[PDB]
Amino acid sequence: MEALAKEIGIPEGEYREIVQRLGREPNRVELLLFKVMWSEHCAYKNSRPLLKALPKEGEAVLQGPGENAGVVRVGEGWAVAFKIESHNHPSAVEPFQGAATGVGGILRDIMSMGARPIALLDSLRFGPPEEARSRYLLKGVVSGIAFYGNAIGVPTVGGDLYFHEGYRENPLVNAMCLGLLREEHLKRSRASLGRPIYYAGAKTGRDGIVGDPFLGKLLMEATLEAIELDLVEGVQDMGAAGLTSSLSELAHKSGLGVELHLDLVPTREEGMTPEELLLSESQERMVLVPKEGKEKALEEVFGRWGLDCVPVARTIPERVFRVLFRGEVVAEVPTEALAEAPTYVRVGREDPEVRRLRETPIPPLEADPQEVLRRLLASPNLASREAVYERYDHQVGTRTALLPGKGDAAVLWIKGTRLGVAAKVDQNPRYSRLHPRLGAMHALAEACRNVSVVGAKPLAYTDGLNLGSPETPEGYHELAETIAGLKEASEALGVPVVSGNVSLYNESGGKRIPPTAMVGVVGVLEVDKRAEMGFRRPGEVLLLIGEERGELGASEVLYLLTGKEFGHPPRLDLGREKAVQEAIRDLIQRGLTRTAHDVAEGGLLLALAEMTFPYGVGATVEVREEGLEALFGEAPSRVLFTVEKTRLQEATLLLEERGLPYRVLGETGGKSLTVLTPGGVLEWSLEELLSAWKAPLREVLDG
């Protein structure tokens, strides 16, 4: 029956392997099950072999890759679950539902760990902001993101937005979620023999073979209460491949099989066929396995939240996924056959054009810095995302609260404790397109730097990989270099992966999106020893860890002045990066500084301007090197911070004992940003910096 086989999308080679795993040919239904379970989305066929390289060990790791999300210990009995997913292709066809659905799904993965969602972060990539479609997609996904999150009660505390040429055809929408729980309640996707499997949530319809957040809230409370009462031994959310992936996965990890009675499955539409029920991806659906003797309890938990919770399947000793419908066995495939699909290895080769661009020498450039800073602040990639986060609410919850003082990483305070959880997601497409490996390294480094900058220690990360097809040598190369990049940054900084995602085939017409590894990092700190980026008072000494000179390759200023992106991305010394991150955390924990900000895209001056916005406090400094490289050039491992006058020596003593280059630029205060250079004084009023920075994205989004 190879006919229908290759007619649905299953490769001859793959089909032949399926007949040898079943010792027979699958019927129509079984064939449809494999088509979906063996697709790259579910099987990760081309990425698994490479992902084995990512370091997983870490002091704070409680749960790494394998479960619906990664979990790390944060102290005083608390733990944090988190993960990042993608909903690219669907957001492309319909931005509103795509984004909202991306949020619903990520939320369920975090809930299944028994962790109550405390925050959402979005990682977005669209084409240039002047193009109609780019504006459309941006309006769509943020509208959709706001809709689900605001309705379910989980705030979107931050994220990463970037506009770029390489995303014109394939936009990216990744959602990261943070959830907290008591370690004692850490649950996974396990089931013991002889247990019934419950189904709760919306009824199964003919969906993706729109999300309801209102029902999501109910679903979330019940699941969380159910686990908080220790009534379950396993919980699984239903997403891609619906019931099929939920149960087979659950069964496979449990070392046994599951018998599904489709007739007991709640239906929303009439005349639904077996495959339709099995492959529906209807939203807000949940699988739960009550512990022995707690079935009733589980039902009551859902009864309390006005939800139905009914038995739909049971575990069996035979490691198989047996599907029953109207009295007949319509499918019975071995669990292993469904969960362990073939993987592929290829030979990557870099796209010669990528090399050509990277090796292009950066030409001598000249421009009026008075205007370059204003032009950079007005760039849609550097301007305020204020109009975006204004769509979201619920910064204050029932256990956690977002600290309103703008820090480089979102900081969620755990009420009743001194604990604070910091989070950030990063990646630079320009660096990544020109040097995927260095781009990936920069992403993890930056994310960790941002958390370190508010005073928290990086505990682990989550990586949402987004690339073109792995078929072509150039594409596989980008995937390979991206993964090698993370490994290298991870090993050097001592920060392990705990979860993640992989989205491939993000390309059309031979045009590949810039390799995109959206790195999410979680860390913890004492809310009382926190730092934010805004200058808070006049008279503080302003210092810089690292050097003033940045590079122009793949930089913002280069793009602004040439309209192009080329050259080598900034070099990254992982040893320096680690030492700087520890230096800044020490500085903050010892109470020497409570205001820090790292120097990233746009260079020293842009970083400087961003610090005057939060409180309207200016700064006066001296930069010893003139030239674009010093004022706007980019370089990692650079951090700005302020100390109280009589504490300068202790801070400088600390940096010196760490062998770290540093400089005392000047002080804070006034209603201007003033910069002395060997060629004179450059000056801007905080007003002009502010208006230039505030307008760009606000009109694009609300105009």
Ligand SMILES: Nc1ncnc2c1ncn2[C@@H]1O[C@H](COP(=O)(O)OP(=O)(O)O)[C@@H](O)[C@H]1O
């Ligand atoms: N790039 C990656 N890095 C680390 N872990 C990953 C990566 N991609 C996938 N994983 C892990 O492999 C598993 C598969 O993800 P997935 O099946 O898509 O979960 P779901 O479908 O419910 O969103 C998860 O445990 C996930 O955390």
Ligand SMILES: [Mg+2]
């Ligand atoms: Mg930053």
